[PDB]
């Protein structure tokens, strides 16, 4: 699983994931499923930001915390948008909203509810992907064109396929907590 992560995700993604774990005192060589899941989430965030026209999205996820909030608070000042209680993943300059992205090993509906709740913000839009082609967005507004979504869903499906080929999928699949 460690090896699969290091083989399947760009080294920038792996470095950020390693860092995010060690900031919580977790060792990526031991909590290897969390390692994969962080990497997957970052990957989808980055894919998603490429999905628009360029300049459509600002990436917030993946930044150190000071930079992330610097971006967030700059956008709130510029655009007048309500400042979130916790860091989201992207800002959409076309729809003028923050977006919270989730990638679930469970079911999109439950994950969406947990997110809606974990953040509970009237403002932030939420878009959840599963590894089996499901997707659940705020007000069924899916933000990107269907081709862009399909590339994301295809990447997640390929990851899941590649893990199951190494017998990693069962354990990974079962590792997400409510
Ligand atoms: Mn985030
Ligand atoms: Mn997220």
From Swiss-Prot:
Give the intrachain disulfide bonds. none
As recorded in UniProt, coiled-coil segments are none
Q: How is it modified after translation?
A: Phosphorylated on serines and threonines by host kinases, including human casein kinase II.
UniProt: Mn(2+) 2 binding residues? 61, 89
Transmembrane stretches, by residue range? Answer: none
Localization, per the record, is:
Host cytoplasm; Host nucleus
Q: Where does Mn(2+) 1 bind?
A: 41, 61, 89, 100-101
The effect annotated for residue 23 to K is: Reduced affinity for Baloxavir and Baloxavir marboxil
The record lists the effect of residue 36 to V as: Reduced affinity for Baloxavir and Baloxavir marboxil
Please, which domain of life does this record's source organism belong to? Viruses
Question: So where's the catalytic machinery, residue-wise?
Answer: 115
Q: What is the effect of changing residue 38 to T?
A: RO-7 resistant, reduced affinity for Baloxavir and Baloxavir marboxil
What is the annotated role of this protein in its UniProt record? Plays an essential role in viral RNA transcription and replication by forming the heterotrimeric polymerase complex together with PB1 and PB2 subunits. The complex transcribes viral mRNAs by using a unique mechanism called cap-snatching. It consists in the hijacking and cleavage of host capped pre-mRNAs. These short capped RNAs are then used as primers for viral mRNAs. The PB2 subunit is responsible for the binding of the 5' cap of cellular pre-mRNAs which are subsequently cleaved after 10-13 nucleotides by the PA subunit that carries the endonuclease activity.
Q: Which family does it belong to?
A: Belongs to the influenza viruses PA family.
Q: How would you summarize the oligomeric state and partners of this protein?
A: Influenza RNA polymerase is composed of three subunits: PB1, PB2 and PA. Interacts (via C-terminus) with PB1 (via N-terminus).
Q: What is this protein called?
A: Polymerase acidic protein
The gene name reads PA
Q: Which residues of the full protein are shown?
A: 1 to 196 of 716
């Amino acid at each position: 699983m460690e090896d699969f992560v290091r083989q399947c995700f760009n080294p920038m993604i792996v470095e950020l994931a390693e860092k995010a774990m060690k900031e919580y005192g977790e060792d990526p060589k031991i909590e290897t499923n969390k390692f994969a899941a962080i990497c997957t989430h970052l990957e989808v965030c980055f894919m998603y930001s490429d999905g628009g026209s360029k300049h459509r999205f600002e990436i917030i996820e993946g930044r150190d915390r000071i930079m992330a909030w610097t971006v967030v608070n700059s956008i709130c000042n510029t655009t007048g948008v309500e400042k979130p209680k916790s860091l989201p993943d992207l800002y959409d300059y076309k729809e003028n909203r923050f977006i919270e992205i989730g990638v679930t090993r469970r079911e999109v509906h439950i994950y969406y509810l947990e997110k809606a709740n974990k953040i509970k913000s009237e403002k932030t839009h939420i878009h959840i992907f599963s590894f089996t082609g499901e997707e659940m967005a705020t007000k069924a507004d899916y933000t990107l064109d269907e081709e862009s979504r399909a590339r994301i869903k295809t990447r997640l499906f390929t990851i899941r396929q590649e893990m199951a080929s190494r017998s990693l999928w069962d354990s990974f699949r079962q590792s997400e907590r409510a």
